[PDB]
Design an enzyme around this catalytic site. Structure first.
Site, PDB file in Angstrom:
ATOM      1  N   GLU A 177       4.334 -35.906  62.290  1.00 23.05           N
ATOM      2  CA  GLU A 177       5.709 -36.430  62.470  1.00 23.05           C
ATOM      3  C   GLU A 177       6.695 -35.292  62.345  1.00 23.05           C
ATOM      4  OE1 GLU A 177       5.888 -40.108  60.341  1.00 23.05           O
ATOM      5  OE2 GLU A 177       4.563 -41.123  61.590  1.00 23.05           O
ATOM      6  N   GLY A 178       6.407 -33.939  62.525  1.00 22.66           N
ATOM      7  CA  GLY A 178       7.438 -33.029  62.410  1.00 22.66           C
ATOM      8  C   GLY A 178       7.572 -32.474  60.971  1.00 22.66           C
ATOM      9  N   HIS A 278      -6.361 -44.385  20.663  1.00 24.84           N
ATOM     10  CA  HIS A 278      -5.166 -44.217  19.856  1.00 24.84           C
ATOM     11  C   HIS A 278      -5.525 -44.630  18.540  1.00 24.84           C
ATOM     12  CE1 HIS A 278      -2.996 -48.048  19.476  1.00 24.84           C
ATOM     13  NE2 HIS A 278      -3.412 -48.180  20.743  1.00 24.84           N
ATOM     14  N   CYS A 296      -6.641 -50.932  24.952  1.00 25.71           N
ATOM     15  CA  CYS A 296      -6.872 -49.530  24.479  1.00 25.71           C
ATOM     16  C   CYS A 296      -7.872 -49.588  23.435  1.00 25.71           C
ATOM     17  CB  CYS A 296      -5.560 -49.165  23.472  1.00 25.71           C
ATOM     18  SG  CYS A 296      -4.103 -48.854  24.366  1.00 25.71           S
TER      19      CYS A 296
HETATM   20  C1  LIG Z   1      -3.516 -50.661  24.437  1.00 25.47           C
HETATM   21  O1  LIG Z   1      -4.252 -51.721  24.398  1.00 25.47           O
HETATM   22  C2  LIG Z   1      -2.031 -51.114  23.973  1.00 25.47           C
HETATM   23  C3  LIG Z   1      -1.512 -51.033  22.559  1.00 25.47           C
HETATM   24  C4  LIG Z   1      -0.034 -51.516  22.257  1.00 25.47           C
HETATM   25  O2  LIG Z   1      -1.918 -50.219  21.748  1.00 25.47           O
HETATM   26  C5  LIG Z   1      -1.349 -50.562  25.410  1.00 25.47           C
HETATM   27  C6  LIG Z   1      -0.869 -49.315  25.569  1.00 25.47           C
HETATM   28  C7  LIG Z   1      -0.547 -49.455  26.989  1.00 25.47           C
HETATM   29  S1  LIG Z   1       0.901 -48.934  27.658  1.00 25.47           S
HETATM   30  C8  LIG Z   1       1.041 -47.390  28.731  1.00 25.47           C
HETATM   31  N1  LIG Z   1       1.284 -47.679  30.205  1.00 25.47           N
HETATM   32  C9  LIG Z   1       2.037 -48.816  30.272  1.00 25.47           C
HETATM   33  N2  LIG Z   1       1.166 -50.026  30.644  1.00 25.47           N
HETATM   34  C10 LIG Z   1      -0.379 -51.128  27.217  1.00 25.47           C
HETATM   35  C11 LIG Z   1      -1.891 -51.623  27.920  1.00 25.47           C
HETATM   36  O3  LIG Z   1      -1.587 -52.386  28.932  1.00 25.47           O
HETATM   37  O4  LIG Z   1      -2.907 -51.124  27.556  1.00 25.47           O
HETATM   38  N3  LIG Z   1      -0.776 -51.421  25.947  1.00 25.47           N
END
Ligand SMILES: *C(=O)[C@@H](C(C)=O)[C@@H]1C[C@H](SCNCN)[C@@H](C(=O)O)N1
Ligand SMILES: CC(=O)N[C@H]1[C@H](O[C@H]2[C@H](O[C@H](C)C(=O)N[C@@H](C)C(=O)N[C@H](CCC(=O)N[C@@H](CCC[C@@H](N)C(=O)O)C(=O)N[C@H](C)C(=O)O)C(=O)O)[C@@H](NC(C)=O)[C@@H]3OC[C@H]2O3)O[C@H](CO)[C@@H](O)[C@@H]1O
Length: 349
Positions: A177-178, A278, A296
């Protein structure tokens, strides 16, 4: 008299600027070659020591007319010739961006990622314009995660010690498309140690193996039945010493009975959907035992810091035996979950 040839034809239009322009002499040698735009300004070029060939040495413009003048001399006398042609006139431009960054060492799961800043109408053209070299050489293939971003990877995890060189030669290529590339990009990266961390919901342990050998075992608490951690292969992304996860970014207010504003330490991202490994000081009792998170991989503060320190972009986390489904192949970090026949067959059309 000398025979002059050129890589362009007199009066051509829509001449693509992905390639230099060249001139050759036969039965003689080139004395000089000049190529000028319609303001009389020369294009840089270089004549070979032997005098048999000349080439432009710098990128040509879009939407330009160029006039090429060449004189050759041989044992037949001289010849001088002239031609003019006009280069592509794009409808639009896009600039590619390539990951990972130049000079980085990444893990064995890291794909090549080329993201354009505009929708790509001719995916096949973009693919053909992207040249990937590997050493040791390994077969891989392109697959589009969305209209803007294409990935390349091998069938299996990269072998450690692999050099990867990426030339995205999109300048002068019609991407449909150019729409032409604004400019080429390059990158070069290296594959490091094989690091694969496995979280097995039957043990609630996250075991980190380097080159097949256990180096770390971490109790974990993954996602509740209600918000389960998906099984599958995850590619490690960015890391953050400290990050604030906030309800109301979507639109659920912090002061609501599902609201939160969570300070989190030592957070290593493993899916675009939001899974991180984490520090979870609040669930250390549940780690190794009971799933408690929103999906998480919760580990202890010092286990989380170990991971942040010792895992790199492109390493792998494999989750198995949870109550979730499988991580989507097009998550963004979920590429390895797409079976090879499907990935290789691509989706360029
Ligand atoms: C992991 O289970 C959660 C926490 C509060 O420890 C987690 C962090 C992520 S946010 C990153 N991107 C936006 N969704 C969310 C998740 O849905 O896992 N909550
Ligand atoms: N086909 C287009 C061309 O074709 C090939 C290209 O060859 C082209 C066609 C070519 O240049 N042919 C010669 C015979 C040619 O056209 N030479 C002209 C002479 C033009 C002319 O007709 N002059 C006469 C002048 C004298 C008589 C009269 N015309 C006058 O002066 O009034 C020049 O360079 O100025 C190849 N050569 C390279 C890369 O160097 C290459 O391989 C595939 C392709 O590119 O593209």
């Amino acid at each position: 008299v000398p025979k002059l040839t050129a890589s362009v034809t007199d009066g051509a239009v829509g001449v693509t600027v992905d390639a230099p322009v060249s001139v050759t002499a036969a039965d003689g040698v080139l004395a000089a070659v000049t190529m000028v735009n319609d303001n009389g300004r020369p294009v840089a070029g270089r004549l070979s020591p032997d005098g048999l060939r000349w080439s432009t040495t710098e990128q040509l413009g879009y939407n330009r007319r160029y006039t090429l003048n060449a004189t050759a001399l041989g044992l037949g006398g001289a010849a001088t010739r002239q031609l003019t042609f006009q280069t592509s006139s794009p409808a639009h431009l896009t600039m590619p961006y390539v990951m990972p960054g130049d000079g980085e060492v990444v893990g064995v799961g890291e794909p090549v990622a080329i993201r354009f800043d505009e929708n790509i109408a001719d995916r096949g053209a973009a693919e053909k314009a992207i040249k990937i070299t590997t050493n040791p050489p390994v077969e891989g293939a392109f697959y589009w995660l969305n209209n803007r971003e294409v990935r390349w990877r091998p069938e299996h995890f990269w072998k450690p010690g692999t050099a990867v060189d990426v030339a995205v030669n999109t300048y002068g290529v019609d991407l449909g498309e150019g729409m032409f590339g604004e400019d080429n990009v390059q990158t070069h990266f290296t594959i490091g140690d094989e690091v694969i961390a496995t979280a097995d919901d039957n043990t609630k342990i996250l075991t980190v193996r380097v080159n097949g050998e256990v180096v770390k075992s971490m109790p974990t608490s993954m996602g509740k039945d209600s918000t389960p951690t998906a099984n599958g292969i995850y590619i490690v992304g960015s890391r953050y010493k400290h990050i604030i996860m906030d309800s109301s970014t979507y639109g659920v207010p912090v002061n609501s009975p599902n609201g939160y504003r969570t300070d989190v330490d030592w957070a290593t991202q493993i899916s675009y959907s939001g899974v991180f490994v984490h520090s979870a000081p609040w669930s250390v009792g549940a780690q190794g035992h009971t799933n408690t998170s929103h999906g998480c991989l919760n580990v202890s503060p010092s286990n989380a810091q170990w991971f942040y320190d010792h895992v790199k972009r492109g390493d792998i986390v494999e989750v198995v035996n949870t109550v979730g489904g499988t991580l989507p192949g097009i998550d963004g970090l979920g590429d390895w979950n797409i079976p090879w026949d499907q990935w290789r067959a691509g989706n360029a059309k």
